[PDB]
Amino acid sequence: QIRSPISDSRFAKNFIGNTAFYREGLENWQRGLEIGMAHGYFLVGPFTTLGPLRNTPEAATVGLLSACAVIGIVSVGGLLFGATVKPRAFDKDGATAGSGFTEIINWHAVGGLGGAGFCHLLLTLF
Amino acid sequence: FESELGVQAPTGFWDPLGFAKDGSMKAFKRRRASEIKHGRIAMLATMGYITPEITGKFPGYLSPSTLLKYDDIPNGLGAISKVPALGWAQIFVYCGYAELSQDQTPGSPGAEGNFGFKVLTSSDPDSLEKKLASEIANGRLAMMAFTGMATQDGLTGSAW
Amino acid sequence: FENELGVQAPVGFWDPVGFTADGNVASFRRRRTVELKHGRISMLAAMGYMTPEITGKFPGYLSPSTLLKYDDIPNGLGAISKVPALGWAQIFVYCGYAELSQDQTPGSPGAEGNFGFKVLTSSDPDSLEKKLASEIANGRLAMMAFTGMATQDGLTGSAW
Amino acid sequence: REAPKVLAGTGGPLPESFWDPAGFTNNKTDEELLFYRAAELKHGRIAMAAVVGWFTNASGFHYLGDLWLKKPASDNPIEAFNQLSLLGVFQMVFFIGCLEWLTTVPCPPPKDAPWDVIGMSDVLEEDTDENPMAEYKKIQMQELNNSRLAMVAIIGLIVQATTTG
Amino acid sequence: FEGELGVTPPMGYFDPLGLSSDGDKKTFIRRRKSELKNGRVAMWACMGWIVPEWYRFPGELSPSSGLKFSEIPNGMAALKALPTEAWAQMGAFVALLELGPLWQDESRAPGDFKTCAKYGFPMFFVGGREGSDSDPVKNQYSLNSEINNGRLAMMAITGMVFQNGITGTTGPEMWA
Ligand code: CLA
Ligand SMILES: CC(=O)O[C@H]1CC(C)(C)C(=C=C/C(C)=C/C=C/C=C/C=C(C)/C=C2C=C(/C=C/[C@@]34O[C@]3(C)C[C@@H](O)CC4(C)C)C(=O)O/2)[C@](C)(O)C1
Ligand code: KC1
Ligand code: KC1
Ligand SMILES: CC1=C(/C=C/C(C)=C/C=C/C(C)=C/C=C/C=C(C)/C=C/C=C(C)/C=C/C2=C(C)CCCC2(C)C)C(C)(C)CCC1
Numbered sequence: 001q002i003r004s005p006i007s008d009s010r011f012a013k014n015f016i017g018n019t020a021f022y023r024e025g026l027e028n029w030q031r032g033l034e035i036g037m038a039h040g041y042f043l044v045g046p047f048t049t050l051g052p053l054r055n056t057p058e059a060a061t062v063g064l065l066s067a068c069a070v071i072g073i074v075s076v077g078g079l080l081f082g083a084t085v086k087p088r089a090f091d092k093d094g095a096t097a098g099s100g101f102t103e104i105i106n107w108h109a110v111g112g113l114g115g116a117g118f119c120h121l122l123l124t125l126f
Numbered sequence: 127f128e129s130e131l132g133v134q135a136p137t138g139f140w141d142p143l144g145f146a147k148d149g150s151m152k153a154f155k156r157r158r159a160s161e162i163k164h165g166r167i168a169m170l171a172t173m174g175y176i177t178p179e180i181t182g183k184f185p186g187y188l189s190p191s192t193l194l195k196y197d198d199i200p201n202g203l204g205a206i207s208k209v210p211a212l213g214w215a216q217i218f219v220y221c222g223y224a225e226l227s228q229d230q231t232p233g234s235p236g237a238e239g240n241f242g243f244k245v246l247t248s249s250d251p252d253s254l255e256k257k258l259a260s261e262i263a264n265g266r267l268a269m270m271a272f273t274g275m276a277t278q279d280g281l282t283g284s285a286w
Numbered sequence: 287f288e289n290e291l292g293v294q295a296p297v298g299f300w301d302p303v304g305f306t307a308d309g310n311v312a313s314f315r316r317r318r319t320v321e322l323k324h325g326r327i328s329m330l331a332a333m334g335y336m337t338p339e340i341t342g343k344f345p346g347y348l349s350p351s352t353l354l355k356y357d358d359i360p361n362g363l364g365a366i367s368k369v370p371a372l373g374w375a376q377i378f379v380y381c382g383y384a385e386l387s388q389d390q391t392p393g394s395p396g397a398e399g400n401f402g403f404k405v406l407t408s409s410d411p412d413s414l415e416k417k418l419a420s421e422i423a424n425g426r427l428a429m430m431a432f433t434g435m436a437t438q439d440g441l442t443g444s445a446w
Numbered sequence: 447r448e449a450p451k452v453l454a455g456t457g458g459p460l461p462e463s464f465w466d467p468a469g470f471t472n473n474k475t476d477e478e479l480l481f482y483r484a485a486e487l488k489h490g491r492i493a494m495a496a497v498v499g500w501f502t503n504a505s506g507f508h509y510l511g512d513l514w515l516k517k518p519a520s521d522n523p524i525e526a527f528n529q530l531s532l533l534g535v536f537q538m539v540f541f542i543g544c545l546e547w548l549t550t551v552p553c554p555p556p557k558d559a560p561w562d563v564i565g566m567s568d569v570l571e572e573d574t575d576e577n578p579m580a581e582y583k584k585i586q587m588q589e590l591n592n593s594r595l596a597m598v599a600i601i602g603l604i605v606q607a608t609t610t611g
Numbered sequence: 612f613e614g615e616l617g618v619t620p621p622m623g624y625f626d627p628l629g630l631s632s633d634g635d636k637k638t639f640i641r642r643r644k645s646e647l648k649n650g651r652v653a654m655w656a657c658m659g660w661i662v663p664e665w666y667r668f669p670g671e672l673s674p675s676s677g678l679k680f681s682e683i684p685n686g687m688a689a690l691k692a693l694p695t696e697a698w699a700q701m702g703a704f705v706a707l708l709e710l711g712p713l714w715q716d717e718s719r720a721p722g723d724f725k726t727c728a729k730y731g732f733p734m735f736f737v738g739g740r741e742g743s744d745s746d747p748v749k750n751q752y753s754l755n756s757e758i759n760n761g762r763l764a765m766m767a768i769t770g771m772v773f774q775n776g777i778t779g780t781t782g783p784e785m786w787a
Contacts, residue, residue, distance in 0.1 A: 003569055010565020011553050018552035025637060126695035144729035144743040144750065153741065231473060391447065391467055532696045536703045547710040 028090055028103040036111020043067035044119035064120035071112030078105030127154055131258045152232060159230065162239030165265015168272045175201060175275055202279035287314050291422045315392055322399035325425020331432045335362060335445050362439035452476040453483060457590050484560035490593020493600045500603050524607050612639055616747055617758040640721055647722035650761015653768045660686060660771055672697055686781035687772065720745035
């Protein structure tokens with residue numbers, strides 16, 4: 001609970017607090033979708049270039065496939081975490097332990113696929 | 127606001143794009159000030175176009191050092207580059223002093239278009255509204271006429 | 287506005303058209319300001335038109351990069367061109383500092399004329415008012431004199 | 447005329463040197479004067495950064511653009527900026543827009559101190575007399591004075607260039 | 612949600628699948644903002660598909676590349692014909708619009724942006740000098756006109772995208 005400007009200034013409180021993982025008014029699926037879109041759009045990057053098939057016409061497609069694979073693997077890991085730990089930090093009233101976190105991870109997988117596809121689209125075009 | 131000087135008769139409260147809904151007052155007050163000032167400038171400029179056309183260009187030399195007989199400066203667009211940059215600076219300074227005179231800050235007597243000309247101060251014969259509304263209506267008409275005049279001056283190529 | 291500066295022996299009510307409202311305290315304070323300022327500037331200008339011809343122009347360069355020995359610059363008017371724009375810009379920045387250092391907004395002690403240049407720093411004696419009156423009288427004389435000299439070298443070559 | 451007490455001795459040749467010679471402070475509510483200070487500090491911080499960027503571009507430290515242009519970029523910061531592709535310029539515009547969005551929509555600045563975009567006023571206490579090393583007002587004045595100086599310095603650099611070469 | 616702006620006599624309160632069957636006013640407000648923004652974007656896109664076939668702009672896109680407005684193929688071929696700098700600049704402009712003047716304030720009405728006048732007039736872009744604020748009761752006819760015109764233009768832009776995908780062209784064949 002120590003106070004530091006990096007972790008207790010108003011910018012930090014309203015920045016981490018307004019992220020998808022913490023933003024008020026967001027359903028679990030919205031948080032998952034937003035985090036997934038961010039992760040998927042990021043992950044296409046380091047694969048299309050800096051990869052085995054760099055200097056090939058299908059570099060963007062291979063990067064997209066690898067980014068989707070990484071999103072799927074981390075989503076399986078998140079499902080594993082929700083099945084084992086059941087974080088319970090996002091569950092609504094009643095429901096079951098870890099339902100909110102599992103929904104977040106599933107929609108993170110969906111958003112990761114979406115963001116990876118969007119990055120691949122923006123690479124093939126323009 | 128639905129009863130100010132602007133509403134003449136041919137059109138009532140003419141706010142087609144709804145700038146008045148939930149009248150912000152201060153917004154409307156400063157927009158009325160802008161309307162008054164723009165109309166006055168438009169009237170002056172419409173003079174500055176239609177009078178040099180009929181009345182000949184000033185008998186004089188404008189710049190005593192750079193041979194501007196007012197005849198090499200054409201009436202219309204393009205005179206921006208013909209009048210000296212120093213002359214433009216000086217007319218700019220005149221306007222700047224005229225405004226940086228009596229304040230037109232929000233709420234001040236300068237903020238409603240009142241500045242202190244009083245050329246036509248009719249002795250309150252139910253005619254203060256006459257002169258105010260006439261100035262506003264002629265301001266709107268002169269701004270529209272100015273826009274049309276500048277479009278004719280540029281589109282056609284010169285003057286009219 | 288009776289016992290300030292202007293009252294002296296030959297005249298002291300000299301105002302054929304001024305004192306428009308006979309009041310406007312702020313207007314008269316601003317007018318005494320411009321009086322003291324224009325007076326000082328006119329005195330410096332008259333000296334700068336008076337020191338060159340007798341006790342001849344300084345020996346030196348004034349611009350060793352551009353070799354503009356103080357003497358070869360024309361005495362009157364024409365000096366506005368040959369002195370480099372670098373030096374003119376430095377003159378202008380000195381003037382801007384001298385005016386904007388102390389606040390010129392009306393009401394301040396610097397508004398009425400006291401710029402804090404108390405060389406003799408008269409410790410509010412009876413000498414204060416007589417020094418003020420001599421300053422303002424020589425200021426009016428210097429304004430007239432420098433307008434005359436500027437006209438003279440505008441119509442006949444150098445300052446004479 | 448004294449300071450409007452919402453600025454309250456925060457600038458001038460000296461700290462208590464309310465300097466406005468244009469009547470840009472009178473008959474103005476506290477929110478507007480706070481806006482003026484926030485605009486001054488933002489313009490400053492931007493300038494103070496821009497002066498350092500100019501002097502590190504005009505000193506040959508112009509990588510990341512040495513590589514983008516694939517050849518040594520111009521030392522003149524204006525020409526160096528012109529050498530940048532429109533993609534890079536609009537990336538800079540987009541990043542500054544995202545930063546401005548951050549400090550308005552998700553992380554609004556404190557109401558009484560709009561210049562505190564980082565929200566530093568929620569972790570700092572104040573300058574107090576019990577503190578032998580109290581310098582928060584002093585560093586605020588350092589920031590303000592360097593801001594006001596760099597605001598004219600960067601304009602001197604920009605207008606001096608593109609008109610003299 | 613019958614009684615909200617958008618309900619129009621030709622269909623009435625539609626909701627066949629019952630997406631907004633429950634109350635959850637937050638979800639309805641979100642979907643109303645989405646509907647209004649998609650409708651506005653689709654009306655913009657339908658104009659951007661109609662007008663270029665009549666008024667190819669006078670000048671040139673890139674003066675240093677000679678690309679004139681009269682040669683970029685209309686429809687879904689400018690995606691791979693217009694230079695990527697132009698597309699990136701358009702995307703950045705839309706980003707600045709939505710992050711700046713056109714960021715929805717949750718207290719205001721769903722489609723209400725303070726910076727815009729009634730018929731969509733950008734009363735910002737003029738010193739940034741604010742605009743209207745939503746009054747549903749007086750402009751209700753214009754409100755529903757905008758909403759269902761946006762619906763029609765969304766269906767229209769989808770149809771025209773598929774027309775370009777099928778016929779390959781955007782001349783007379785696409786429009787039939
Ligand atoms: C910039 C000039 C200007 C300004 C500030 C105003 C301001 C005002 N007018 Mg007004 N008016 C103007 C010009 C202007 N008018 C002109 C030229 C006409 C003639 C067509 C009128 C006719 C008119 C009527 C008939 C009425 C008003 C009324 C009003 C008041 C309420 C409406 C409102 O909020 O408008 C806010 C101000 C604006 C919306 C101005 C924005 C103009 C946009 C930006 C441009 C419009 C298109 C333009 C021609 C494009 C030219 C090209 C350009 C991009 C280069 C307000 C004080 C009403 C009133 O007085 O009620 C009491 C009223 O009944 N006006
Ligand atoms: C800067 C400035 O001054 O601007 C200001 C000016 C304004 C006016 C205030 C303003 C605004 C907004 C306004 C009111 C504009 C209105 C928009 C409405 C658009 C409606 C549209 C598109 C609807 C359609 C549907 C279409 C589809 C039809 C077809 O194609 C289809 C599917 C298939 C073809 O086979 C056959 C077809 C039948 C052909 C079509 O084609 O039309 C603005 C810009 O916001 C500000
Ligand atoms: C009483 C104070 C006064 C003086 C003493 C003065 C003197 C000169 N004016 Mg002048 N002037 C005003 C006041 C004064 N002007 C006012 C109130 C206005 C209305 C806005 C105005 C308008 C213009 C315009 C439009 C031009 C102009 C010029 C010159 C000029 C030529 C110098 C040169 O050519 O060497 C000289 C000496 C021309 C120009 O060149 O500006 C430098 C030119 O175009 N002035
Ligand atoms: C083409 C026609 C035209 C229109 C349609 C128009 C409209 C508006 N002008 Mg305007 N204008 C000109 C032409 C037009 N202006 C010209 C030729 C000049 C040079 C003489 C000029 C000068 C200024 C200045 C100095 C200001 C100004 C403003 C506004 C304003 C905001 C009011 C409001 O929205 O509250 C609106 C709507 C003020 C503003 O807020 O600017 C940030 C302001 O200070 N204008
Ligand atoms: C640089 C910088 C920074 C930042 C960084 C970062 C963090 C970045 C990131 C970035 C990013 C990371 C971005 C992202 C983006 C994303 C996107 C743009 C996405 C999109 C997506 C989409 C759009 C999708 C869609 C979809 C879905 C939803 C599903 C289905 C399918 C589809 C496709 C339809 C900082 C401040 C630190 C500082 C320094 C500078």
